[PDB]
Design a protein around this ligand. Structure first.
Ligand SMILES: CC[C@@H]1NC(=O)[C@H](CCCNC(=N)NC)NC(=O)[C@](C)(NC(=O)C(C)C)CCNC(=O)[C@@H](c2ccccc2)NC1=O
Length: 304
């Protein structure tokens, strides 16, 4: 079985490189962040432009939705995160504390907490309702490229240019596991699998790896793409066949068979590095976004 993703819509509007795209949990919307300091909201099924959300003072590197699809959180070079009401576009909270670019963000499944990572080498855990920084973890010795909660919010995984992935206990802030392979390339992205049993990590050596973090064992390796410079998002696709999806510095979206590691499809169309991909929660739809020579988001749909 191989998917048959085909281009359905190209979403133009951002005036600079797009940095991150995410589908709302309710499947209705796509949020995009950009170096142009804006967040844009689009219809997930028709690619129709809905609204622009503004307020950050510098470019935005990441955006993420709350579980109820009512809030967004964004991470900016202005050293803050902002929590937004999606319906009104209003900034509800400005999360101050990081001392350098905020690079990555995510809500926990309960959506009472936000986790963030920064070029200041720390991971911060914030209370959504008050905006208070609850914990600052001295997580890494180089910029933090990704942060993600597991399925029940009890763990956080972080990755960094220092070459490590670390697993943290959300409640205590203790580091439960430091993961590394024999070689130490910068880790440019990490996330838990939907079931929370594995982590998928990208390294700046043109490789993605699937790890059983508890055992400290690498189960699968994915290659053939180009990734030595940018922090590119990767995903688990589970609505049809079980795939791994990532962008690439050769301007293509890569799709691999998770179990066999074989490349099953490469999506052509972007005119610059595909920095971000996202998978729709209920349909076989991928959103991809690209850098400065492209500035567009593309929506692709498959039968599996
Ligand atoms: C979207 C532009 C692109 N930005 C980046 O690649 C990253 C964000 C990557 C996407 N986000 C994530 N992976 N978050 C989990 N941010 C960054 O890098 C920083 C932190 N911030 C921005 O860029 C904002 C202006 C958005 C730093 C400045 N940008 C850059 O210097 C430039 C670059 C050029 C060469 C190599 C790497 C990155 N990035 C770029 O050309």
């Amino acid at each position: 079985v191989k998917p048959n993703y085909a281009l359905k819509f190209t979403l133009a509007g951002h005036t600079k490189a797009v940095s991150s795209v995410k589908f709302s949990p309710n499947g209705e919307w796509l949020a995009s962040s950009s170096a142009d300091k804006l967040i844009k909201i689009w219809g997930a099924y028709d690619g129709k432009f809905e609204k622009t959300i503004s307020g950050h003072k510098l470019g935005i590197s990441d955006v993420a939705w709350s579980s109820d699809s009512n809030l967004l959180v964004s991470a900016s070079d202005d050293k803050t995160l902002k929590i937004w009401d999606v319906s009104s576009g209003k900034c509800l909270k400005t999360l101050k504390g990081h001392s350098n670019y905020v690079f990555c963000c995510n809500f926990n499944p309960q959506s009472n907490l936000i986790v963030s990572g920064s070029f200041d080498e720390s991971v911060r855990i914030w209370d959504v309702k008050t905006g208070k920084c609850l914990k600052t973890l001295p997580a890494h010795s180089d910029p933090v490229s990704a942060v993600h909660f597991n399925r029940d919010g009890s763990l956080i995984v972080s990755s960094s240019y220092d070459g490590l992935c670390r697993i943290w206990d959300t409640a205590s802030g203790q580091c439960l596991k430091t993961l590394i392979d024999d070689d130490n390339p910068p880790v440019s992205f990490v996330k838990f699998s939907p079931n929370g049993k594995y982590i998928l990590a990208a390294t700046l050596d043109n490789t993605l790896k699937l790890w059983d973090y508890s055992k400290g064992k690498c189960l699968k390796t994915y290659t053939g793409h180009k990734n030595e410079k940018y922090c590119i998002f990767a995903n688990f696709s589970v609505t049809g066949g079980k795939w791994i999806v990532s962008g690439s510095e050769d301007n293509l979206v890569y799709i691999w068979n998770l179990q066999t590691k074989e490349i099953v499809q490469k999506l052509q169309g972007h005119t610059d590095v595909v920095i971000s991909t996202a998978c729709h929660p209920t349909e076989n739809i991928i959103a991809s976004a690209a850098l400065e020579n492209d500035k567009t988001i593309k929506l692709w749909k498959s039968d599996c």
